[model samples]
Target chain A: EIVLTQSPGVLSLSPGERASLSCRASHGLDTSHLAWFQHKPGQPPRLLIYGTSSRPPGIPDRFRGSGSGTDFTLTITKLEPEDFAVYYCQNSGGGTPLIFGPGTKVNIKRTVAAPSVFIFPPSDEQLKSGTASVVCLLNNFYPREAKVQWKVDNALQSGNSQESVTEQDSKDSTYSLSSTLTLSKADYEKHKVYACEVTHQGLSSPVTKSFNRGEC
Target chain B: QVRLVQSGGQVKKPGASVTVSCEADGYDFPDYYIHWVRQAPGRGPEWLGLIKVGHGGAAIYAPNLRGRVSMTRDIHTTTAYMTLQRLTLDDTATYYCSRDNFGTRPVPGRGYYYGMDVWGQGTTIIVSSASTKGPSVFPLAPSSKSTSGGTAALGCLVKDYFPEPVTVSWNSGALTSGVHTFPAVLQSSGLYSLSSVVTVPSSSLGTQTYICNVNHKPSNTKVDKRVEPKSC
Candidate 1:
């Protein structure tokens, strides 16, 4: 005779990100019956509450509790991004029988998000006068947040750069873009780390790649 | 590989006491621990405690024979003993002395009790020495039934065979065989008596029926009490 519903995805609050996370209890709860737990990744879960509003002696006050009788409000005054983990509530009011709604879990992000990729440009094509200007294009990516930089080996290559948004082939996304470079044959022989970088909200960790050309 | 055959019954009055012994055989006697548990008139077993046959040590009680229970054997005679005190009628039961070796670690032992996963050929002990005259079915069970998922309890009374070992078991098996013992008491008629109670799982009604049987035999005879589900 107990029902508990919790928000499914993990709520990503950036550095200083402020958000209110909650779990709903569909049945009336005996105040002394509710208990909560915080399970951070790779660490042992810690008990946040026992015998209702009371914390385990020395737990931090940032973890707060409120609400009446059956509905409980467990509010963390300032949710630290590192505070990203699952939370659950249980009932233990001097009895275990006739007790059903143990609790629920809250996740901040969808477990599986979109993939991200990076690309680097070749430098040797800059030798011949006609080929002095080489084009570097970074495309075939999932993020609209990519930033590209062109270089002849180590020195940064600059020009009146233009970012062309192209549609991704076989899908509804940008397919390609070009970044032009001017250099001498000697600039071509020098190995370089021309780069493409992107910051996407869905990626767990960022991605980067390098490319260089040999004198022909 | 260890087997235990317990001794017959011993009759005792309200303030009196009794001790039933078990002779160990079939495996290394010193390597196993002997467990003595008691099932009263109608209830689940309460852990009376245990003893190490190899060490001849038993559970220590305070006033009533702190080390009153023990087992011993000569290299010449292979056997163990379970001596109990404060022989009130509450101690009447089908005393089963089993050889339980839950490894040298503590974890397995904790999970093994609360429920008996392994049992032995049980021996019944009637508390009195009065030989019940005629086929005196020492008991008359009360009629009972319950719906599935609900808890159920049954009881039966015994007479004449005072100090007789009685067991109240909960099972759905056809009829299990158990041991019976008739101990002689000089103070009263040499009739032993006993009673037992077993819990019925309302959920297991379909897999099989529930039966509670008492055994403390000289000729290996027992009584059965079955729990059948009634339609709602």
Candidate 2:
């Protein structure tokens, strides 16, 4: 019986950055029979290797395999902007269980600045105040080509017709896009699921941020 | 060195059940484990499992051996015997016997060897009950200049052989084991025509004897080929 163990921790990277992941077999592993994969949150995984060096089925050509006997290496040339995600390795005879390694999470920095003073209906400008509107600050998102959508309760909602999107260029060479929508105060009670999905280079898959909004 | 002598072949129906055995000799009986390997018609060899003689013939698995294998060791003859059940089209193959390491963990010399180091003379077991008792060895290749690397193909198909016992192997540099399979045509006369190809390398082309052994039932290990390399 052959068991496989993987390393924990991620190779954090931003746009145009590089990272690598590793998985090893317990006991002596015939590297020629190794395989690797990539898994993003909420999405099915992908196979990267078969018979060690040979790529199985459909894998990007940018990846290359090298090594001898049990000691092997996998190299990814030209890291893409959306290439930040978790990767794993496996060694199996011909099928599943495949003995997988631990997963890694790649990181991108976020913003903590941008102070926005709220005008509550009880005191400040009543004309500019809304009965129900939640504002969250999302910062440090890598890859300037991210999209933001809105949701109410459980169903997914598209806000292209309900709100206007605005963007501004930052000193870091990346752009930020934010969209805001106004609603009546009657919909603000109970709990709701609000989230932002980010997909770009260096990710194993799309990353999502969700929040539970309670009565304030 | 340890050696294996396999049992003869038998005939069984397609839906019937059959079990095959391989006997072991040489090397201390309790010093090593015994393994059964099968090469389906025209397929690469695959590992079955191992049996510790002292461990109540405890089963060590490869993949599909559970509930299908019964390994029993005889203290009288110091021999390891294996039986496999469930007969199917894929079950037809040239079965082999090999010796494995003893002890739970490996030592320096015979640690964990994946490749087969010693193999028995092959036996072609017929899973079809329609098959009758007879000979089953293909003919041998005509002798030419013998060397480790010189090319040669040995056939041991003997007509009237229901469970054939003929092995094709090279012995010049190192003894390499292989499994070959092809379409078998059954003649009206009850003999099967099997095509097997074994590639002989050049480095072992030295003047040594390669053997095509046949272990027919109730039998002896038939040694057929002897080669002596000549001066170039």
Each model's DockQ?
A: 0.01, 0.01
lDDT (tens digit, per residue) of candidate 2 on B64-129: 656776766775687666676776656777776665443333535534322223556666666654
Report lDDT (CA) for all predictions.
0.43, 0.46
What CAPRI grade goes to candidate 1?
Answer: incorrect
Tens-digit per-residue lDDT, A1-216, candidate 1: 355544433454433444444555676666655656565332323557544465654577877766656566666666664555566554433222212222333323223333223222221221332223333333333433455555444455565233434322223232333333434455555554544433344455544334444311
The candidates score, on chain A by TM-score, as follows 0.44, 0.45
Which portions of model 2 show Cα errors greater than 4 Å? A1-216, B63-65, B102-115, B129-183, B186-232
Compared with the true structure, the alpha-carbon lDDT of candidate 1 equals 0.43
lDDT (C-alpha) at residue A128 in model 2: 35
